[PDB]
């Protein structure tokens, strides 16, 4: 019963930086992640615009920036929702391990960017259709998937169409992508077969 | 390993739903076949996982249907299976026209069954051939 309009208003005014509360969580960690988190956002954004422009026909594409930023605003809003949630579920305030994991932040961000770019599909060479974002970030399908269900429970403002799109990406990971030879899954299966 | 169990759990639900969809339209005459096929299907994902490598879930699915029918003498042509599959909303022709064989070689889903599938599973598929009832694998709950 959600409309595209509300999430659009939320992201439009949301901040590009971690909130006071999110930093609160960064400072509660055995190892402080605020540093790697900011730097990662800086570099990926640099890589993302160049790639976007390249995939999009050719030249200079002022639209790549506007999207990445919306991605980041969602990324942070979702990370803080997940943390608040975990805190009331396990009653601990640390989380150092989760928040220092490169893959976790890599997956959250991608997922968040996949949603933002989805809404603006009706906006050559080829662009974003779901798998694209993976290659752009050098992120495996099996890792992305690990972030999907939580992302859906952390963001109460997702449309029906957006959850639907997220599920379709998940089904494609499960049907083949997570089974490619480059997939961490086979190690996860071997590690378990012993 | 939450990651690995979440993954399998969901891959089973998806797989079963698609299997149940095809079996209800293709094998209504023999309602018993679905549970045996699902058993072979699950056995594969769980124990012959190398078979999925660079391959598609639906290719193993249609190959299990075609298999058990064979040992139970139920007449089910692959051409009939393909046509139905095409009706599923996510279905892409390429999934049964271009399937991996050895290294970089692709051919129809038939060459796959006969050249790779049947061989890796021949031994096991035989169990079900025994005129004795099998240890059917548990169906994915999937309520709600």
């Amino acid at each position: 019963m959600n409309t595209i309009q509300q999430l659009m208003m939320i992201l439009n005014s949301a901040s590009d930086q971690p909130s006071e509360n999110l930093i609160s969580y960064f400072n509660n960690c055995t190892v402080n992640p605020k540093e790697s988190i900011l730097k990662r956002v800086k570099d990926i954004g640099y890589i993302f615009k160049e790639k976007f422009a390249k995939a999009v026909g050719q030249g200079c594409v002022e639209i790549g920036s506007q999207r990445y930023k919306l991605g980041v605003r969602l990324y942070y809003r979702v990370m803080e929702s997940m943390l608040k949630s975990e805190e009331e579920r396990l009653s601990i305030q640390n989380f150092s391990k989760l928040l220092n994991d490169n893959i976790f932040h890599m997956s959250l961000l991608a997922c968040a960017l996949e949603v933002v770019m989805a809404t603006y599909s009706r906006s050559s060479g080829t662009d974003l259709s779901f798998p694209w974002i993976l290659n752009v970030l050098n992120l495996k399908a099996f890792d992305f998937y690990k972030v999907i269900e939580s992302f859906i429970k952390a963001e109460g403002n997702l449309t029906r169409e957006m959850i639907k799109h997220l599920e379709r990406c998940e089904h494609r990971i499960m049907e083949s992508l997570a089974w490619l030879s480059d997939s961490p899954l086979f190690d996860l299966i071997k590690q378990s077969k012993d | 390993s939450t990651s690995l169990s979440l993954f399998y759990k969901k891959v089973y639900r998806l797989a079963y739903l698609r299997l149940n969809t095809l079996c209800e339209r293709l094998l209504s005459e023999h309602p018993e076949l679905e549970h045996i096929i699902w058993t072979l299907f699950q056995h594969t994902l769980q124990n012959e996982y190398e078979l999925m490598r660079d391959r598609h879930l639906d290719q193993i699915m249609m190959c299990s249907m075609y298999g058990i029918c064979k040992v139970k003498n139920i007449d089910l042509k692959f051409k009939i299976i393909v046509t139905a599959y095409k009706d599923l909303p996510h279905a892409v022709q390429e999934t049964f026209k271009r399937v991996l064989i050895k290294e970089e070689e692709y051919d129809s889903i038939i060459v796959f069954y006969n050249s790779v599938f049947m061989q890796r599973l021949k031994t096991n598929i035989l169990q079900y051939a025994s005129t004795r009832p099998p240890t059917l694998s548990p169906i994915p709950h999937i309520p709600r």
């Binding site: 997940m82 949630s85 975990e86 579920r89 396990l90 989380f95 391990k97 989760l98 994991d101 893959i103 976790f104 690990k146 972030v147 269900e149 939580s150 859906i152 429970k153 959850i163 599920e167 | 939450t2 990651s3 979440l6 759990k9 969901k10 639900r13 999937i142 709600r144």
Partner: peptide
């Protein structure tokens, strides 16, 4: 709804990377 949530109450995003 109509989406399959496979996580159980005793499970959370933190166990997925744990």
């Amino acid at each position: 709804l109509d989406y399959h949530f496979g996580l159980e109450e005793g499970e959370g995003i933190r166990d997925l990377f744990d």
